[PDB]
């Protein structure tokens, strides 16, 4: 019999082979292989206005990542060069064009339509298939997973969107109008179509179609699709006597329309009101063609299949009206499909290619009209070659990927890649987001559905409004890629199902759906699903095909589409798992791989649909006869950061969530390239350590090669009250010996811009002549070329790169790049590069030492967070009777009401591991039990309770109670007080409001909002309110005439105030006011609003 260790040996091979970012790489590879060709075939060809001239598209291929230098050469490009030079890692797309003249094709001409960004480490990238040494020579970390783009030198990652499954019917309840609605989102060539059939209180079926202003009666639009005879609708809707009765009632209520022409004219009147006779008919036909179920086929021949699908939808609606079937919950992951990188990229490419072909036809038509026929037809090759502008496509792609605003209203599709440490990056690469608006509650959407088990991490989720709408994939997840649909359709047809049009769905027969569209009927659904399962397990067909049957409604569902989330499971046959001991031995020896197990019928992937028919056994010893599958490793249901917490089942859920979220903020050696990388911010921990108590997963996923914390000696007692309310006390001698000591990097960047007209910037030491020339002491360590010396000391407002700009908005503006006003450090490296445009580009990084101090934030993996409350000399710290001096002291009040027994278990385990000389397994559910740790601690000469006797540091006599002390893994967070302190005395001001600026960088002021105003009113301090609001910001003086109240206009020339509107000078008074109020008066007078001011004397 197998044990969880053998299943672990099997499971680790999955990550050993596939990796952790396969959902990006596989989708992008499929896109490159076939999506470009599919889109090109979809567009077809160019149709200009030139007589007897046509262009037919051929094949499209992608070159290698290259860069067009400002100088004529074209050279290979590597990712590090793109990062340093602010380039864009991309490859040119070559498309062949066949010219058709007088219905005759010629020799195709190869043209360059633009450049397409390359996802790193894909099958087309340069880093694919390289060894570790080659990657190191190229300047990259071998542990880097790839799967992200580089746009203008910044790393952009595409987060997967979670959309409703397409071309599927979902029936919902609308109790406000008492309408029972079914909705389908039909997809064809990137266009979406929300088609709904609904039944109101009257029992009449109405159909909603896009671009149709009002719902139309069901049988009206059904007749408009041909199929005019009432018996045809009666048959299509089904063969249930109540259903036939309701359909006949609808027919009686809609006997006005009996001819397809009548219905077409009717929809013409609705969709095109008040227009010509011929226009409305064509508009109605067009709307019917490309707005009613486009996925079924836009060709006018396809009316019959669309009518059949509409009848199926109406049947579902009326069946739910009778309570036969219940409402379908949208959160069920059978109804949700993830939008991977490839799908979104294909949509964007199609959008840009439309503009490209439009520009091509415009340019060709314009050139032919301007010139003569001889000039064009003499050399058609040169004409086509010179009638193309690739920048139209390239700039669209680049800007869409850079800003993140997809064409179609989507925003935030691509986000800047996080690089704080290993966990943060790898977790960002595995994120799933929902398109719903965050402001609304969305109580049902944010909850944890039962189908998320094994597909979505239950703990890792944001804290704020994003709680429940942003989720991360579980460790044992496998997103699918699509397969040729027609081949699956042919195989199913050959299996024995009769086509749909031959016979109607007699309730004695089983409906069969392929990717949500009905395709035929069968008699024995169970035999069919068993046959398909056997073929799938043998290896006859692909492993992406999933089959599920529903006994109650007699339906069979076959899924082969893109974006389903699946998990692996061991197949159980007759109560015996198919994975035997010798298979585990073969996997261990390397003779067998995970893919071989998949192809051998031992392990099969299950999506949310097929899992409906499963009955999974959790543990190997619990397998009984009725079980059909066995769980591989229950500890893998957690996300990547959530696996960091040891003994996570001993903690309260909110604390586990906090710890998982905080594991992405700790400092540490995230990547080996930190020395030569150029990121805006970065941290490095001087002495990282592997956790003593760790889960076995992070050794496999590679975390232990890039640790992000240290092992502290923690004692739990109250000390002087300086550790109260989640504050910690840290030893001083330990800090002075290199504990939690870190370094902070920040990269500044300057560019020698080349303005139009020849006036360019230059790097130099600014002479005192120039305007804006700051103090001489600021440029004190710059070399004569205008660049700072490496390993020099800067302290704030010091110039790093001296640069003077042309006076064009006999002088020279000073535009040097200086350190941030509140920062400090030492210059680490200076890089001189030539940017993409041919000008110069300089990047400087300043490193700063950050010894721990008061206010610095520390946190454990179990959710306990705090700031350093006091630093204590070593001689004042207590010491145990065995000679141990605590590194850090926590408050005993933080343990209860936080309920984190896992922290105490880890505290015991750390000291047990340190005494025993071996690390301790702390896996989620198979880790070392607590009782074993306590017994081992007892065997080593310590108390089983983990408590010890200490002596007080000051008095020197032992404390009355014995104290708990152990070793716990603590992480230093990047919220450090040196980056949060901010002060403002006078500072600069804004332009429009003249209030203090906003932000620490520009010496901004803090915000005194409305709530503070109400607080100050509640205290009853009027003059304090005046002082805080008006006196220190926007003081003003204004003259006003005493009969109109219009703002009197002073005359500096005549030294006399007067009313321009009123012509008054007898009485003008001077009034104090705020600048904001004056601007509000001006803005009211901008409209026709006239505010008349009445003055009074105090």
């Amino acid at each position: 019999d197998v044990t969880p260790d053998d299943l672990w040996i099997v499971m680790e091979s999955y990550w050993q082979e596939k990796g952790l970012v396969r959902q990006h790489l596989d989708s992008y590879n499929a896109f490159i292989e076939r999506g470009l060709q599919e889109v090109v075939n979809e567009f077809g060809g160019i149709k200009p206005d030139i007589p007897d001239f046509e262009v037919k598209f051929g094949k499209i291929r992608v070159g290698e990542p290259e860069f067009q230098e400002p100088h004529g050469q074209r050279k290979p490009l590597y990712p590090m060069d793109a990062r340093i030079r602010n380039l864009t890692y991309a490859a040119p797309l070559y498309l062949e064009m066949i010219p058709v003249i007088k219905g005759v094709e010629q020799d195709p001409v190869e043209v360059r339509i633009g450049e397409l960004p390359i996802m790193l480490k894909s099958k087309v990238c340069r880093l694919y298939g390289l060894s570790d040494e080659e990657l190191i020579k190229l300047g990259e970390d071998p542990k880097d997973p790839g799967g992200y783009f580089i746009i203008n030198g910044s790393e952009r990652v595409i987060v997967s969107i979670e959309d409703i499954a397409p071309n599927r019917t979902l029936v919902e309840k609308d109790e406000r109008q008492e309408k029972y609605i079914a909705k389908v989102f039909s997809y064809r060539h990137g266009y979406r179509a929300l088609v709904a059939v609904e039944r109101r209180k009257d029992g009449i079926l109405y159909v909603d179609i896009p671009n149709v202003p009002k719902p139309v009666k069901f049988v009206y639009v059904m007749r408009a699709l041909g199929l005019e005879r009432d018996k045809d609708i009666v048959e299509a809707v089904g063969n249930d006597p109540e259903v036939q009765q309701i359909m006949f009632d609808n027919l009686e209520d809609a006997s006005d329309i009996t001819t397809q022409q009548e219905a077409l004219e009717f929809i013409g009147k609705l969709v095109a009101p008040g227009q010509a006779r011929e226009y409305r008919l064509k508009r109605a036909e067009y709307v019917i063609d490309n707005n009613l179920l486009p996925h079924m086929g836009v060709s006018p021949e396809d009316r019959i299949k669309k009518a059949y699908y509409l009848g199926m939808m109406a049947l579902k609606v009326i069946e739910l009206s009778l309570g036969r079937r219940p409402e379908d919950d949208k959160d069920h992951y059978a109804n949700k499909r993830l939008r991977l990188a490839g799908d979104l990229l294909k949509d964007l490419f199609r959008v840009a290619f439309s503009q490209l072909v439009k520009d091509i036809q415009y340019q060709m038509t314009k050139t032919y009209q301007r010139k003569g026929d001889k000039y064009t037809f003499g050399n058609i090759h040169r004409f086509i070659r010179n009638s193309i502008r690739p920048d139209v496509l390239t700039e669209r792609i680049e800007h869409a990927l850079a800003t993140g605003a997809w064409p179609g209203g989507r925003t935030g599709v691509s986000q800047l890649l996080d690089r704080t440490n290993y966990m943060s990056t790898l977790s960002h690469l595995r994120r799933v987001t929902s398109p719903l608006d965050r402001e609304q509650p969305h109580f049902e959407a944010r909850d944890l559905h039962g189908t998320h088990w094994g597909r979505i991490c239950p703990t890792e989720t944001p804290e704020g409004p994003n709680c429940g709408l942003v989720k991360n994939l579980a460790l044992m997840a496998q997103i699918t890629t699509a397969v040729p649909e027609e081949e699956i359709r042919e195989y199913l047809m050959s299996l024995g199902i009769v086509p749909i049009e031959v016979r109607r769905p007699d309730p004695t027969l089983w409906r069969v759906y392929l990717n949500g569209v009905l395709i035929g009927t069968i008699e024995d659904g169970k035999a069919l699903v068993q046959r398909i399962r056997q073929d799938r397990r043998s290896g006859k067909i692909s492993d992406v095909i999933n089959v599920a049957y529903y006994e109650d409604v007699k339906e069979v569902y076959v899924n082969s589409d893109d974006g389903r989330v699946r998990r692996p499971l061991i197949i159980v046959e007759n109560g015996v798992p198919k994975l035997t001991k010798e298979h585990v031995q073969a996997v261990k020896e390397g003779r067998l791989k995970w893919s071989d197990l998949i192809k051998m019928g031992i392990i099969e992937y299950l999506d949310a649909e097929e899992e409906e028919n499963a009955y999974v056994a959790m543990w190997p010893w619990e397998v009984t006869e009725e079980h059909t599958h066995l769980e591989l490793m229950p500890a893998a249901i957690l996300g990547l950061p959530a696996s960091l917490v040891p003994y996570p089942e001993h903690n309260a859920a909110p604390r586990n969530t906090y710890g998982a979220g905080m594991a992405k903020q700790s400092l540490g050696l995230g990547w080996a390239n930190f020395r030569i990388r150029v990121d805006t911010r970065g941290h490095l921990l001087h002495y990282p350590q592997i956790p003593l108590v760790n889960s076995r997963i992070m050794k496999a996923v590679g975390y232990e090669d890039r640790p992000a914390g240290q092992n502290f000696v923690v004692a739990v007692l109250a000390y002087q009250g300086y550790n109260m309310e989640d504050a910690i006390i840290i030893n001083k001698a330990s800090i002075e010996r290199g504990l939690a000591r870190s370094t902070f990097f920040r990269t500044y960047e300057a560019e020698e811009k080349k303005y139009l007209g020849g006036q360019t910037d230059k790097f130099e030491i600014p002479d005192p002549t120039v305007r804006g020339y700051r103090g001489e002491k600021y440029y004190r360590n710059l070399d004569e070329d205008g660049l700072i010396f490496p390993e020099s000391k800067v302290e704030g407002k010091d110039v790093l790169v001296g640069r003077t700009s042309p006076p064009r908005f006999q002088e020279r503006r000073e535009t040097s790049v200086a350190v941030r006003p509140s920062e400090k450090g030492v210059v680490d490296k200076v890089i001189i590069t030539e940017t993409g445009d041919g000008t110069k580009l300089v990047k400087v990084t300043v490193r700063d030492l950050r010894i721990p101090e008061l206010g610095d934030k520390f946190a454990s993996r179990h959710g306990q967070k705090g700031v350093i409350g006091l630093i204590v000399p070593q001689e004042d710290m207590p010491w145990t009777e065995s000679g141990i001096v605590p590194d850090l002291i926590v408050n005993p009040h933080g343990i209860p009401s936080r309920m984190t027994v896992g922290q105490l278990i880890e505290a015991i385990g750390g000291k047990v591991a340190s005494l025993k000389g071996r690390r301790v397994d702390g896996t989620a559910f198979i880790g070392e039990p607590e009782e074993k740790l306590r017994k081992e601690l007892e065997e080593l000469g310590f108390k089983h309770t983990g408590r010890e006797i200490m002596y007080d540091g000051i008095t020197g006599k032992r404390l009355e109670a014995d104290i708990f002390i152990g070793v716990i893994y603590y992480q230093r967070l990047h919220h450090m007080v040196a980056d949060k302190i901010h002060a403002r005395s006078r500072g600069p001001v804004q332009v429009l409001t003249k209030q203090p600026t906003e932000g620490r960088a520009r010496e901004g002021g803090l915000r005194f909002g409305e709530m503070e105003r109400d607080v100050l009113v509640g205290h009853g301090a009027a003059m304090l309110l005046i002082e805080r609001l008006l006196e220190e910001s926007d003081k003003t003086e204004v003259w006003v005439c005493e009969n109109c109240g219009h703002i009197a206009l002073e005359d500096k020339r005549r030294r006399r105030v007067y009313c321009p509107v009123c012509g008054e000078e007898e009485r003008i008074s001077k009034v104090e006011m705020s600048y904001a109020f004056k601007l509000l008066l001006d803005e009211l007078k901008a409209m026709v609003i006239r505010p008349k001011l009445n003055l009074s004397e105090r």
């Binding site: 239950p458 804290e463 709680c467 229950p634 001993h650 309260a652 859920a653 909110p654 027994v901």
Partner: protein, 76 residues
């Protein structure tokens, strides 16, 4: 006292919006239970304590319980 009895005896019953855990597959929260089961354990009752450790199903139920409190504060 609730913290003590949850760290020492048992967590108890997990619920969302005042009802037992019901969202999931058809007739069952997780695929590891038979459909149509209404037993105590099958709907959220956790018979273990934080000190004694939770089985994976109890862990999932407890996470489903805590998510409600998080979103509750966020909207409140």
């Amino acid at each position: 006292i609730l913290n003590i009895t949850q760290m020492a005896a048992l967590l108890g019953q997990q619920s969302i919006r005042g009802k037992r855990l019901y969202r999931g597959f058809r007739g069952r929260v997780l695929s590891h239970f038979k459909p149509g089961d209404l037993g105590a354990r099958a709907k959220g009752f956790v018979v273990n304590s934080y000190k004694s450790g939770l089985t994976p199903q109890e862990y999932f139920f407890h996470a489903m319980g805590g998510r409600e409190g998080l979103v509750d504060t966020a909207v409140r």
